[PDB]
Structure 1
């Protein structure tokens, strides 16, 4: 069998050059592809393997030269398959793509960094190969900015990176498949060690094939569109994978680099340099399955996982903490704890007072066990019997004895011992707390409007809905300044109103350690924030959540600093916020309203103005970056994006969404996790002391014109074109995506793109390799300013080379274009769109090509991603696998929607099209990862 010779050729034709000297990516992918196809032949026959290989060879042939003949060949084969062979081929290409992603992660993890490749400016910070590590960022602050070491250390102490993990917009990959992927990565890595013996290599190859087959032989359908509890279980997998051990690894590295610049202290173990938040189970915005019980559930589950990991982790700590010399305080506490009544009988019959650290640590272990057991009982029943005094309820109870051990050990010169497992444990307690993640709530402001309208209607004051914004403000301010409650059990509650109030009741019935922020979707005016503050207090929330408005539409972004100023001017709100105010901006959402360029530039300006307001009133402004941003990309780019943020918008608290489509690339691997946490911490540290350049005024004026032209084009296409929605429902799988499910994709099932949610808007166009929501508007803007003045191109180029914000924006567009193909979208059109609607797509695709050519001119590139050949190489590798899933999805849709489209089937190939469709959706989605 010399089929292996052919796939070696096609891969080498797809990626011919070597982007370094350790570039083994083509080798890795060829190895995985050979093993997988062999497994495929063994399991489903020779004819099936030859069919799959012919399809892939044709797809790589397409992604090389883009001859539409190749697409016609792929389709010719893919329609002749009966549904069974269709499912097999789709599953096959999904898994091959996953293997390609693992090869990429190995390459990135072990690519040698080249110090002679850095240029010396901020552009270095846009790729992992040249970005500054923590110590390079330190020395850069010391050299260019004359910042003293002790200043850098103080800055680090009070800094916080808060990563918010979101549910996957499609398949949150199972925890088991995460582990199998990890095994495949490890086998792949060790196979290329320059010291492995032939028997080690044979057994490694055997384990690699073994794992690949294990992955291919598990189903990814059936059961339910996973309950939010299950989705949350899968989401927390990355703590067991890399993050739990990874946090203290990173922190210790910070300690080392601080030493390597003269700082003799360590980063205080309680300092929250890294924190994690979760939306899984808390985001209700247009999502009815997220009920109050779901929220209580995910809080309790998280507390169980936390207690569990602390329990298993603390035993090794007990083995290490065998000293006897100790502090008088610790001696007293050990004798005190020894006066009491089973969880260490395999280790020691009982812990003697001659190992006091083990005594106290054993008590902490016991309390941890009782905490897990208690939370389990509350989850599965509703009450416990476990005395809350026998558990840990707040973080200070947990930290107090551990800190006693640390101080005590330091009293006796055992500081080095204390800086071991004890230090890593303390740092885990500070990072993860009793809950691992803190839950963020999100809800439409209209739902609070419904609650308050039923409240006022019940009190015979009128309808809160009819009242003007200022009349609402008056009522809410008088009610907040008074102490008299609002309502009781005697309140006509609809289904939605009861859901809202019950949500708040659940928030009040749980520890405040479990919750982060309550976030108001579709925020427009101060009554929307005041409403939530009021409902919180009237639901008896003891320690109330900080209320964070999410300004989405364009006019809302223009109105935002005024609304935040009015809020800051009210004494009640100024006293409640205690000098901190958080505002959420959703790049994807704002782009859905007004196109991407206008949304970006409007968000930069809005952050500037909000900083002006917060400086006026002495409020520390923290910006929360939602899905779609430049800070949501994977890897290197994130660094520059953080550096690019407007000055004094971060201020020691960076809050970014870790989008589901990227979390594997950011935390799936040990090294990847370290370098992610590193670039977040270093980029935050530097931006706090080295703001990006203030834009030249001609840049701001130019961007204002471009924003105008862009939004005009975008809205004229998406909203004003009457026969757009029809095209949207044909040229795109949005309808099938909503009908299948994931969640609901429409707030109002009967409306238009306005009421369509942002995630399905981005997704629907991402599946067809078209990405309309990301680039529409750039074309007419760049075109218009180049025509208005010959020299304006030179200005745009100037910005791309010197203004970080503009560079990161244009770069993201460039990357999305690297993922795009107008011919595939044209294939979807040819199969699913009416003939009289064909020119509509045609013109749109013209806008694509022109915008592509225009973006290049701004960046000074002749090809796409000319400045980051590593990423270009990787995306080129994936596209060959994804394209097959494209043709298959298009023809599958034509087969589902039209039973009048009969095809001469081919006989089934060796040992319900909807399952195929879901496979292609998950595959294409997983391969394209983040766009906009």
Structure 2
């Protein structure tokens, strides 16, 4: 078995240099790949392993020199496989890619930082190896901006970072597989400890093999396209994995960094520096599977998960809190609680005596947590309970009061150090996570609210709210929100959809306010859209209404957005209802689908500028919600610069960002990764509030305004004006098969306009072409270079000195690293009509030209010249993804064309749809985020 000598050689050719001297990435993936191929040989034979290894070697050679012969050599093997071998090979390359991902995460997590590699400017903040940690950000604010530590501390107290967990656009990886990946990363990391004994190392090797086999031997296709409740369960796994333990550890490090600049206080335990929100079970935009019952279910499930975690954590807390000296107030509470009926600690104590007063109070808290868990479970599984609401915690203050009593009491007696231990961690967990872990946002199209109001006005013989102008809509809505008479009853003709909308509001009214965040209006365009939701909320008897958040998607909607928000703030009722706070959402992917990516980027910078101007005019604290597709939605270090790049005063101590599902494992799967994620969000938010990016030079604004026009021209001329573009899109890409398959929901929700943004990005990401991300950049840069010889220099100045522009281009460059026009050409050759071949050829030429122009702008000769660690890891993954690409292409030809007969090969040792699904899930997991 000298086969190992070959994969090592190929791996070393793929990743040649060393990005440091703790660079063990090739070692890691070589070990995992060797062990996997041995498992594969033992289960499916020697021939199967040899076939698979020949394929991988060819793929890696291709990612080296991109010789098209290597692609033809891959295809020759992949077409000759009967569906059984096709399934085994596809599964095999999926798991091989997963192992490359795990090795990459370990390498990232244990890479030593380099203080001497910092250049001293903001470019350092684009990579994890040079970004500023918490304390370096503190000292940068103290030295360069001459801010006093007390100002830094006061900024932190009132700062909030709000991370929003959304469903994965594909395989929301099951909780069990997350755990297996964790065990693999742990075995890997421990195997390279520079002190380990022979027997420990042998047992770790055997544990690693055992786990890799375990992951390879579980099916990941059948049953259902998981119900929204299941997807929510899988999405909540990261709280148990890292986030629950991670929040108090991070906050304590904030305390230590504050001590290292002279601050003696800690960050107050009730200060919400970190918050979590969820769309899982709340986003109904084009998703009929998300019903009123789904929302009720995930709300109660979240209350259960939280009560479970508090219940298990408070037993350790009860063992630690064995003091007897206490406050007079706490002693009074101990005597009161002792007069009652001790069922959840008989294994610990027969009963808690009054000479352990902290244990008395905490034991009663444990009892209330148990009743809350069992009660929410009874509500979920039936619809009623029998658990008195007074025996549980219904709001966060009931929970915090006795814990704070313990903290005050402990501090009274000089036991502050004891109080700053498990008790401080607990208080910070209650403040961060509340009774729900997450707050659920609800999202719905504006048109659905319009349908509801139209049925209402038609039922009252007043006209159709739909035909009314925006001004008449506003006038009627305003008369109703200010009036004293209810609007509608059961005697109302309701369609199925209208009943969905109203029932969602009724379920919101029947659940605790701690469970909900924002009501987000998709396709928001006018103030009447927001006022419709405020009115529907009020008339559905929602006592504590949700905050309404418009999502301005199309480009024209963004241009009209500050006008609409100003008109909203100018209405007296809405002004006094919002209580000085407004949240607006922007969708980078959504706007890019409308007008190309470069135009959407520059338009979103300008739109935030004007919205801040409005908020200052009316004295409102604005919160910008960054949807998916942004620079701030990337994985790792880049986010740090992206946050710093936002326009001045757009954050103001309140950051709300979508954590994309294709990135959540890279960000929260591992202990170190979790800490560093929380750290860069916190540090960048704090720094941006006190140190905005430079204001753009006037010529930069004018130049980008010009480029936006040319870029929208090219993008729309190809996507919307070319008649046969849609025909090509249906051939060169698995868009049709993606919706028809099983993943997500509905993609339409006519033409591309009705197509959702996620399938729009996905379809082209599968083919390694990425047209939605880069299209438009080429013609814009060509146009400005040709108009004036000097514009190139100006572009090169912007990329070097304007953070916004650098992050925009940097994201484009990263997407180009994951692109390969040769593979896209293979899709054309197999799946596209001949008379459409020049069309794709032209698009590929555009791909090439933009690439060179993007390089010229960034001052680079190769892609990602400034981030070799990412270039290295991407090359590693691409070697596995390429095989799944060729396999997916030929599998598509086999599905669509039963007249394409292939010379089959004999089956290799112990359904084309399953193959296709495997390749989609795999390629998606290897490319992760693009646009």
TM-score in terms of structure 1 length:
0.99
3-state DSSP of counterpart to 2:442: strand
Can you list the C-alpha shifts for 1:381-415, whole angstroms capped at 9, x where unaligned? Answer: 00000000001100000000000000000000000
* C-alpha contact (below 8 Å) 1:232/1:298 kept by paired residues: yes
* C-alpha contact (below 8 Å) 1:97/1:882 kept by paired residues: yes
Residue in structure 1 matched with residue 862 of structure 2 by the alignment: 863
Q: What is the CA–CA distance in structure 1 between the aligned matches of 2:10 and 2:312, rounded to whole Å?
A: 49
* C-alpha contact (below 8 Å) 2:446/2:523 kept by paired residues: yes
Gaps spanning 5+ residues in structure 1: where? Answer: none
Residue in structure 2 matched with residue 842 of structure 1 by the alignment: 841
* C-alpha contact (below 8 Å) 1:650/1:688 kept by paired residues: yes
Can you list the C-alpha shifts for 1:751-796, whole angstroms capped at 9, x where unaligned? Answer: 0100000000000000000000000000000000000000100000
Q: How does 1:502-517 map to 2 (within 5 A)?
A: 502-517=503-518
* 1:909 Cα offset (Å): 0.3
Q: What is the CA–CA distance in structure 2 between the aligned matches of 1:351 and 1:573, rounded to whole Å?
A: 52
* 1:207 Cα offset (Å): 0.4
* 1:704 Cα offset (Å): 0.5
Q: How does 1:503-652 map to 2 (within 5 A)?
A: 503-652=504-653
Residue in structure 2 matched with residue 812 of structure 1 by the alignment: 811
* C-alpha contact (below 8 Å) 2:747/2:755 kept by paired residues: no
Can you list the C-alpha shifts for 1:338-388, whole angstroms capped at 9, x where unaligned? Answer: 101011000000000011100000000000000000000000000000000
3-state DSSP of counterpart to 1:624: strand
Q: What is the CA–CA distance in structure 1 between the aligned matches of 2:561 and 2:112, rounded to whole Å?
A: 46
Residue in structure 1 matched with residue 474 of structure 2 by the alignment: 473
Q: What is the CA–CA distance in structure 1 between the aligned matches of 2:195 and 2:426, rounded to whole Å?
A: 35
3-state DSSP of counterpart to 2:632: helix
Q: What is the CA–CA distance in structure 1 between the aligned matches of 2:471 and 2:836, rounded to whole Å?
A: 47
Q: What is the CA–CA distance in structure 1 between the aligned matches of 2:432 and 2:747, rounded to whole Å?
A: 34
Q: What is the CA–CA distance in structure 2 between the aligned matches of 1:97 and 1:354, rounded to whole Å?
A: 58
* C-alpha contact (below 8 Å) 2:555/2:594 kept by paired residues: yes
* C-alpha contact (below 8 Å) 1:278/1:440 kept by paired residues: yes
The 4+ residue runs of structure 1 with deviation greater than 6 A are none
3-state DSSP of counterpart to 2:781: helix
* C-alpha contact (below 8 Å) 1:643/1:691 kept by paired residues: yes
* C-alpha contact (below 8 Å) 2:747/2:759 kept by paired residues: no
Can you list the C-alpha shifts for 1:842-881, whole angstroms capped at 9, x where unaligned? Answer: 0000000000000000000000000000000000000000
Q: How does 1:430-509 map to 2 (within 5 A)?
A: 430-509=431-510
Q: What is the CA–CA distance in structure 1 between the aligned matches of 2:786 and 2:693, rounded to whole Å?
A: 30
3-state DSSP of counterpart to 1:369: helix
Q: What is the CA–CA distance in structure 2 between the aligned matches of 1:646 and 1:484, rounded to whole Å?
A: 44
Can you list the C-alpha shifts for 1:605-650, whole angstroms capped at 9, x where unaligned? Answer: 0000011111111111110000000000000000000000001111
Can you list the C-alpha shifts for 1:64-106, whole angstroms capped at 9, x where unaligned? Answer: 0000100000010000000010000000000000000000000
3-state DSSP of counterpart to 1:867: coil
Can you list the C-alpha shifts for 1:669-724, whole angstroms capped at 9, x where unaligned? Answer: 00000000000000000000000000000000000000000000000000000100
3-state DSSP of counterpart to 2:584: strand
Residue in structure 1 matched with residue 160 of structure 2 by the alignment: 160
* C-alpha contact (below 8 Å) 1:713/1:780 kept by paired residues: yes
Residue in structure 1 matched with residue 188 of structure 2 by the alignment: 188
* C-alpha contact (below 8 Å) 2:90/2:919 kept by paired residues: yes
* 1:912 Cα offset (Å): 1.1
* C-alpha contact (below 8 Å) 1:591/1:598 kept by paired residues: yes
* C-alpha contact (below 8 Å) 1:164/1:279 kept by paired residues: yes
Q: What is the CA–CA distance in structure 2 between the aligned matches of 1:71 and 1:771, rounded to whole Å?
A: 20
* C-alpha contact (below 8 Å) 1:561/1:609 kept by paired residues: yes
* C-alpha contact (below 8 Å) 2:444/2:521 kept by paired residues: yes
Q: Please, which moves more after superposition, 543-552 or 475-484?
A: 475-484
3-state DSSP of counterpart to 1:631: coil
Can you list the C-alpha shifts for 1:476-507, whole angstroms capped at 9, x where unaligned? Answer: 01111112111001110000000000000001
Q: What is the CA–CA distance in structure 2 between the aligned matches of 1:240 and 1:483, rounded to whole Å?
A: 48
Structure 2 residue 374 is the aligned partner of structure 1 residue 377 = no
Q: Please, which moves more after superposition, 362-371 or 482-491?
A: 482-491
Can you list the C-alpha shifts for 1:895-917, whole angstroms capped at 9, x where unaligned? Answer: 00111111010010001100010
Residue in structure 1 matched with residue 268 of structure 2 by the alignment: 268
3-state DSSP of counterpart to 2:667: helix
Q: What is the CA–CA distance in structure 2 between the aligned matches of 1:919 and 1:193, rounded to whole Å?
A: 35
Q: Please, which moves more after superposition, 736-745 or 72-81?
A: 736-745
* C-alpha contact (below 8 Å) 1:642/1:687 kept by paired residues: yes
Q: What is the CA–CA distance in structure 1 between the aligned matches of 2:927 and 2:825, rounded to whole Å?
A: 18
Can you list the C-alpha shifts for 1:515-564, whole angstroms capped at 9, x where unaligned? Answer: 00000000000000000000000000000000000000000000000000
Q: What is the CA–CA distance in structure 1 between the aligned matches of 2:98 and 2:484, rounded to whole Å?
A: 58
Q: What is the CA–CA distance in structure 2 between the aligned matches of 1:432 and 1:814, rounded to whole Å?
A: 37
Can you list the C-alpha shifts for 1:412-440, whole angstroms capped at 9, x where unaligned? Answer: 00000000000000000000000000000
Can you list the C-alpha shifts for 1:193-239, whole angstroms capped at 9, x where unaligned? Answer: 00000111001101000100010000001100000000000000000
* 1:577 Cα offset (Å): 1.1
Q: What is the CA–CA distance in structure 1 between the aligned matches of 2:795 and 2:813, rounded to whole Å?
A: 15
Q: What is the CA–CA distance in structure 2 between the aligned matches of 1:565 and 1:240, rounded to whole Å?
A: 43
* C-alpha contact (below 8 Å) 2:228/2:281 kept by paired residues: yes
Q: What is the CA–CA distance in structure 1 between the aligned matches of 2:87 and 2:363, rounded to whole Å?
A: 54
* 1:741 Cα offset (Å): 2.6
Q: What is the CA–CA distance in structure 2 between the aligned matches of 1:920 and 1:337, rounded to whole Å?
A: 60
Q: What is the CA–CA distance in structure 2 between the aligned matches of 1:293 and 1:822, rounded to whole Å?
A: 46
Q: What is the CA–CA distance in structure 2 between the aligned matches of 1:12 and 1:363, rounded to whole Å?
A: 60
Can you list the C-alpha shifts for 1:24-61, whole angstroms capped at 9, x where unaligned? Answer: 00110000000000000000000000010000000001
* C-alpha contact (below 8 Å) 2:644/2:688 kept by paired residues: yes
Q: What is the CA–CA distance in structure 1 between the aligned matches of 2:747 and 2:873, rounded to whole Å?
A: 33
Q: What is the CA–CA distance in structure 2 between the aligned matches of 1:166 and 1:592, rounded to whole Å?
A: 20
Q: What is the CA–CA distance in structure 2 between the aligned matches of 1:353 and 1:59, rounded to whole Å?
A: 71
3-state DSSP of counterpart to 2:560: helix
3-state DSSP of counterpart to 1:647: coil
3-state DSSP of counterpart to 2:753: coil
* C-alpha contact (below 8 Å) 1:625/1:655 kept by paired residues: yes
3-state DSSP of counterpart to 1:275: strand
* 1:744 Cα offset (Å): 4.2
* C-alpha contact (below 8 Å) 1:652/1:684 kept by paired residues: yes
State how many pairs are aligned: 928
* C-alpha contact (below 8 Å) 2:368/2:393 kept by paired residues: yes
Q: What is the CA–CA distance in structure 1 between the aligned matches of 2:337 and 2:741, rounded to whole Å?
A: 57
* C-alpha contact (below 8 Å) 2:813/2:854 kept by paired residues: yes
3-state DSSP of counterpart to 1:464: coil
Q: How does 1:93-492 map to 2 (within 5 A)?
A: 93-341=93-341, 342-492=343-493
* C-alpha contact (below 8 Å) 2:645/2:693 kept by paired residues: yes
* C-alpha contact (below 8 Å) 1:326/1:411 kept by paired residues: yes
* C-alpha contact (below 8 Å) 1:287/1:744 kept by paired residues: no
* C-alpha contact (below 8 Å) 2:375/2:385 kept by paired residues: yes
Q: RMSD over aligned Cα, in angstroms?
A: 0.6
Q: What is the CA–CA distance in structure 2 between the aligned matches of 1:577 and 1:400, rounded to whole Å?
A: 28
3-state DSSP of counterpart to 1:289: coil
Q: What is the CA–CA distance in structure 1 between the aligned matches of 2:179 and 2:126, rounded to whole Å?
A: 30
3-state DSSP of counterpart to 2:662: helix
* C-alpha contact (below 8 Å) 1:184/1:212 kept by paired residues: yes
Residue in structure 1 matched with residue 740 of structure 2 by the alignment: 739
Q: What is the CA–CA distance in structure 1 between the aligned matches of 2:858 and 2:65, rounded to whole Å?
A: 24
